[PDB]
Design a protein around this nucleic acid. Structure first.
Ligand code: UBD
Ligand code: MG
Ligand code: MG
Length: 358
RNA sequence: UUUUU
């Protein structure tokens, strides 16, 4: 019992994907404490129209003004579960809607979408059915853990630079001004909780959002959100082509799901400065590879994801929060399944299970 | 968040 991942198997018509609706949000503060509000939301604030072009020093503050979240702490779905617990009787869709849904992080769905084309990094997804609801929580693979622990100094800095770029592009208040003199604390995060549906699979998922754009004529989330990104400066048509085929696929896969309409990219030079900005509308990303023999196709991404959801739902028959069906995948092969009980794979906490049961 | 496919 396995699931194949080749694009050729999923090249059919684009499947049904419900326009995402924001059900709520939550913020994690500097101490990684949960708050059921939008206190962590920042606002899009690009360089003044009449001022000089951007010249953001992404290395500024590294590492003295860097407070990185502890990656050894595996939160899994915990924060999202707290939101669900605090909103279980306020969910739309009618009675039993949650019972037929699949709950997970936007990032987990993004990895599913890119699976047909990914050739370097594999993954593992733990699944448990509890009160009908199917929960999907990613598991760091042994290899990914090793790669993380062996993270090169350069990669460590590049990760900081991505967060630093946000600091140069966001203000704490609408129409306010960015403040690059502060600390980059990655425990801080604003998450949107959304409702959608792929095929006949209702979805409830949360995703971290970079900022809200006040200037945007459309003020209703998620349409008012913006995704920020950094990438190396490119000069040759060849570099741009590679960017379209590989990087854009991941940018599209991340922003399409939550309904974030724009991705603003900061291109950094070898010295670590962002001296150029470009906006990539999510719904136009595919245009760059539509007639490309080596490009990606959104339909393949979504059809595979729908296929995996069907596969997971049919495989996880037993309603038991202590039972886990681990779905494993490595480039070059199909998605396989193994069954496990309790620690270490079980991920639904007793505080959630006991409350939902009572 | 980021390097690469
Ligand atoms: O990128 C891929 C590549 C392969 N597969 C699968 O790996 C299994 C063994 O084929 P092989 O690659 O020759 O080792 C086959 O499924 P099978 O066991 O025959 O149903 C391929 O379809 C897949 O799902 N994605
Ligand atoms: Mg983000
Ligand atoms: Mg971003």
């Amino acid at each position: 019992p396995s699931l194949r991942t080749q694009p050729s198997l999923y090249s059919g018509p684009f499947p049904f994907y419900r326009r995402p609706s924001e059900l709520g949000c939550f913020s994690l503060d500097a101490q990684r404490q949960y708050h059921g509000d939008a206190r962590a939301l920042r606002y899009y604030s690009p360089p003044p129209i009449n001022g000089p072009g951007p010249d953001f020093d992404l290395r500024d503050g590294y590492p003295d003004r860097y407070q990185p979240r502890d990656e050894e702490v595996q939160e899994r779905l915990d924060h999202l579960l707290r939101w669900v617990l605090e909103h279980r009787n306020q969910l739309e869709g009618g009675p039993g809607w949650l019972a037929g849904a699949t709950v997970t992080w936007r990032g987990h769905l993004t990895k599913l979408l890119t699976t047909p084309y990914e050739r370097q990094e594999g993954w593992q997804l733990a699944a448990s059915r509890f009160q009908g609801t199917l929960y999907l929580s990613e598991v760091e693979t042994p290899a990914a853990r090793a790669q993380r622990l062996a993270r090169p100094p350069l990669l460590r800095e590049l990760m900081y630079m991505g967060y630093k770029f946000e600091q140069y592009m966001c203000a704490d208040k609408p129409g306010g001004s960015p403040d690059p003199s502060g600390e980059v604390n990655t425990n801080v995060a604003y998450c949107s909780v959304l409702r959608s549906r792929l095929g006949n699979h209702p979805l409830l998922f949360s995703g971290e959002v970079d900022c809200l754009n006040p200037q945007a004529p459309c003020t209703q989330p998620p349409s008012c959100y913006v995704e920020l990104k950094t990438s190396k400066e490119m000069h040759s048509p060849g570099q741009w082509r590679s960017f379209y085929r590989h990087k854009l696929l991941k940018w599209w896969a991340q922003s399409f799901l939550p309904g974030v309409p724009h991705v603003v990219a900061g291109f950094r030079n070898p010295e670590g400065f962002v001296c150029s900005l470009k906006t990539f509308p999510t719904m136009e990303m595919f245009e760059n590879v539509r007639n490309d023999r080596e490009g990606w196709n959104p339909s393949v991404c979504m059809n595979f994801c729908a296929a995996f959801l069907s596969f997971a739902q049919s495989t996880v028959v037993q309603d038991d929060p202590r039972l886990v069906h681990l779905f494993s995948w490595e480039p070059g092969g199909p998605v396989t399944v193994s069954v496990h009980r309790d620690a270490p794979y079980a991920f639904l906490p007793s505080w959630y299970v006991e409350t939902m049961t009572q």
